[PDB]
Ligand binder design. Sequence first.
Ligand SMILES: Nc1ccn([C@@H]2O[C@H](COP(=O)(O)OP(=O)(O)OP(=O)(O)O)[C@@H](O)[C@H]2O)c(=O)n1
Lengths: 250, 50, 120
Amino acid sequence: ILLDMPLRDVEQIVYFNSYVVLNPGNHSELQYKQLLNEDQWMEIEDQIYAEESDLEGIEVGIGAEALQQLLQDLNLNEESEKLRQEIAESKGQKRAKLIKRLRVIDNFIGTESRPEWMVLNVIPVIPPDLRPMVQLDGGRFATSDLNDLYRRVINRNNRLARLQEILAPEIIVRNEKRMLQEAVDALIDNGRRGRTVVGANNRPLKSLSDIIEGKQGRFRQNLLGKRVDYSGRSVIVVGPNLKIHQCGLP
Amino acid sequence: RHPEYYQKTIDKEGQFSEDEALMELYRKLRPGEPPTVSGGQQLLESRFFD
Amino acid sequence: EKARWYAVQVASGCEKRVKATLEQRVQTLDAANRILQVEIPETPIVKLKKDGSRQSAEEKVFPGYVLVRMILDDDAWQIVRNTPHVINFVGAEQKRPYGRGRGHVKPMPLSPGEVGRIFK
DNA sequence: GGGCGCATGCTGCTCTAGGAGAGGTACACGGCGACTGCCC
DNA sequence: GGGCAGTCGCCGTGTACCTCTCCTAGAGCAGCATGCGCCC
RNA sequence: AAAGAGGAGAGGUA
Ligand SMILES: Nc1ccn([C@@H]2O[C@H](COP(=O)(O)OP(=O)(O)OP(=O)(O)O)[C@@H](O)[C@H]2O)c(=O)n1
């Protein structure tokens, strides 16, 4: 909604399936925020690299995450004024859509937030006492699901850093970047986008979003109801000759 | 027993040869991969006759 | 020569097996003209043991990929993709038309400068 | 025959990994919002 | 241009209590105790 | 000073 693009294009720029034009340059067919392909990028690369003139417009087409750069180029006040001006001369379903966008934009002005904060550079790690290891099994150890996801994320990060250090060819690095993105996605919310991570048996793991979600989540199990001390339970029989305010306790 | 009923399917879907049918089977069963006659034969044999 | 260099994704710790199996298959199929040579680049680096002495053992530079010199043709692609312990080629991914799962990966050769750099 | 040396099956330490399907498929039911086809 | 109509995907589906079992991963590599052959 | 950690199946009683 913020970038005014369909979800398919944004999903294709991420996960390394297409390119995006970050700067048209002095071209006649290229446009800002235009989806490209491998063959088309090859054609434009042949055109620019033919050592010709009139193409020295610095065409910047980067097919990567490349969302931080697009979100960093946003000016909120100018877009707010433009949308407010354009709202009046419109009607029907065309107006409503614009209204929606306007809403979001004004939010980012009220809270003084930056739209590029939706792309992550650092990841928090939960305290270790909330994901215990447990020392049963005699010689083995218990299974916890958060630790596996954290370990996978760390492994992918270390491999990508090592590959980047020694200047590997830039067709193997993109693979590692894609697997790192998928690993982080699986850590946050398992099965929301693509395939689900499966443990030993064909049973999906429990992510961070599965702890707070449903009937067995934190809210409806540990906060709105609890187990208590000083309580008992037993079978009931009938006692006549009692008073209406009395009971019999073993 | 009613051959005139299948004529509609033949007309509205066109006619095929063995190799063209195998190529079409590969195309629809495995999207994206380059079609091949031997490939489609392999899918058919591994699907319904192995 | 049209024989270009490609990278193939294999299983973890299953690169020597893939190399041996692929070379044996390509020899027994009399297709040595299409697939020329497969390799797993290595580099000896200091491997300091319990004491201060370095074992200086060999480790892989790309732990998970194997390099193949071949002429990219349909049949050779079919033989290569049918080898056990091989996931897929390395290249440009494509959007899956319908349903979930991965798409079709178009192979891409290594540039002459890179292939010069890896091969000293 | 007997002590010793080597081959070998058994088993415990280790580490590492972690990708991607193989196929376990085809398999409930209602309500609501977000795209897309083919025509007027 | 302007849509209707159709289709696809995500959300939801009462409460307390009792008993029995199986599992925390799986494959490579090296140490070891055993069996069998050898030279005196 | 110490003492139980979770998970998954199957079967019951209001
Ligand atoms: N799925 C169920 C089954 C039973 N109950 C509880 O258990 C009671 C069943 O009582 P029960 O003794 O089995 O039957 P009654 O209807 O009382 O009839 P009777 O005692 O005469 O057989 C229900 O009313 C209800 O309080 C329930 O909550 N949920």
